[model samples]
Target: SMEQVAMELRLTELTRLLRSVLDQLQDKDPARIFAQPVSLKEVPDYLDHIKHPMDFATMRKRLEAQGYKNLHEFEEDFDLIIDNCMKYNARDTVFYRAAVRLRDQGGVVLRQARREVDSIG
Candidate 1:
């Protein structure tokens, strides 16, 4: 069945798709709040509150390292970035609002990726 070749092709497609999604989200984050790891000194309570912290920088590194095997893994980290922001900041704050916006817009991108992935098979 040449299953190995098929798997390689699938991974190639997913890598491109995930990179595009990450780039779009990074561009959307003008504040750079989600750009890097949350500073422990700046927010000492961050670790206590957020057990699992996800950021764009970490996602980029993971993506470059082929850490994600499928769309779902990528999607989880993407959602985690927004979810962490929403949970840490107050509803009235800019960080929370930005996360809401990113979620709404990024959700569209994610669904589009899903459609493309489905077509890959």
Candidate 2:
């Protein structure tokens, strides 16, 4: 439903939705808010900070604690996205990845709020 909800929104509308959701301090979740764990939106053209800072052992331990026995591939894929400077949908957040590479308009902008208000049967 959230996916369908997001499918109905335009880029600007999606950005606004993300901001509105983030404005509610009580609802904020650092990790789920972004595609990655760290939080910092919008990097300038010259600065690059888009990498998951976890070693295999740490990641394995962390993921295992969450009922996951495998996470290296996910981490690597995220790394590849970072290395390509791509912008991806991490829940409701839309930040750029500088390590990978994203044209100004290439970020994956999702409009989750658009569908949230629509009644679901």
Candidate 3:
């Protein structure tokens, strides 16, 4: 289930943000590309912060106002976000991306996810 979703997600993310990613790729110097590895390692923590943003309560209020109804947090949240990363063909891909793709895929993953889920809801 997640594989399918993640596949679609990653494909969509890659598709949607291909331009953005390529832009970064273009400006990047292959020789000095090794300079910023930590940004890649920081994405999971980044996702955690993004998901639980400081205004969770306000966001919940807003979601409820939209008639989404009886919203409840679940362990599913992580599974969905983290699992959907299977598009890279590995349950561990997104995690490793924390140190591999760096911000290249990090923020794109989240924003694409937000859009994907929004479309579903």
Best by lDDT: 1
Write down the TM-score of every candidate.
0.89, 0.20, 0.20
| RMSD of every prediction | 1.8, 16.8, 16.2
The TM-score obtained by model 1 is: 0.89
Task: Write one digit per residue (lDDT tens) for candidate 3, span 14-107.
Answer: 3444334223432332333322322336455645433332122332344334322211232233223333343323546434343245335444
lDDT of 2 by residue, 7-49 (tens): 5443334334334432331123233322443334543432354
Winning model by TM-score: 1
Model 2's TM-score against the true structure? 0.20
Considering lDDT, which of the candidate structures 1 and 3 is the better prediction for this target? 1
Could you arrange the candidates by lDDT from highest to lowest? 1, 3, 2
Tell me the tens digit of each residue's lDDT in model 1 across 6-115.
Answer: 88777877888889888987887887878898999989989999989999999999998878998889888988889888998999998899999888878777778889
How accurate locally, in lDDT, is each candidate?
0.87, 0.35, 0.38
Error of 2 at 111 (Å): 14
Model 1 scores a C-alpha lDDT of 0.87
Q: What is the lDDT of residue 56 in candidate 1?
A: 95
